[PDB]
Design a binder for these strands. Structure first.
Length: 164
RNA sequence: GGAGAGUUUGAUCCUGGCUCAGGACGAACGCUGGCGGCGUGCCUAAUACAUGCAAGUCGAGCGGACAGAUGGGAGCUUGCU
């Protein structure tokens, strides 16, 4: 479903890109923005930020962030299993680990996983070093996650039978 | 038990290069330098070497030399032979 706006969003920015456009006179410098937005309890999202200024792009990032959020399973403050997302030439894989392992991730990706609350991820940016698509490389993989009690309900099977 | 970042462009994504942060040296150089353990210390020339030492041991394997004086005796200077 759609995640409601009845939460506590923390919304720290990642990068700012100044982005041009060439008219009869000369250039026109605007700014681009993207802000990873969420709580620390499993809801992550973002939106684009476009303006003619610095701070109003920060404002309009929050709108589509509250229009588009997504939820992640938090089994033991980890991802419950291993997955590899492949959206648009930026491959970023996701590996779970033990609870002491911290958050080892790429630059913009590290400002995503701490905005999940999930603190145990190994990852490695296989694909390109572009900030929009690396975040698209994360949530697309995080969308394809599964829960332990859910797939047993999908299989019509016991949850403990998935473990033993 | 797996971090990435600058760069082609007016601007964007890819693509693709190199660059960079890290870790080691039997390392050298520049500048400085108080000490203590533990460890290494000719990779090039297996090129040439002054000087000293680096493999001898058994007299219970053996002949002889080699000193020896336990005493014995000799010639006298009492110093010796």
């Amino acid at each position: 479903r759609i995640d409601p706006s009845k939460l506590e969003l923390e919304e720290r920015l990642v990068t700012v890109n100044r982005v041009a456009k060439v008219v009869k006179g000369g250039r026109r410098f605007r700014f681009a923005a993207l802000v990873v937005v969420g709580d620390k309890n499993g809801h992550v999202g973002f939106g684009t930020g476009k303006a003619q200024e610095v701070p109003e792009a920060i404002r309009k990032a929050v709108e589509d962030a509250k229009k588009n959020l997504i939820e992640v399973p938090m089994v033991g403050t980890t991802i419950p299993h291993e997955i590899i997302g492949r959206f648009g030439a930026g491959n970023i894989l996701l590996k779970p680990a033990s609870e002491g392992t911290g958050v080892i991730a790429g630059g913009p990706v590290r400002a995503v996983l701490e905005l999940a609350g999930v603190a145990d991820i190994l990852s490695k940016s296989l694909g390109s070093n572009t900030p929009i698509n690396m975040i698209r490389a994360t949530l697309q993989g995080l969308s394809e996650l599964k829960r332990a009690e859910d797939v047993a309900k999908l299989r019509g099977k016991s949850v403990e039978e998935l473990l033993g």
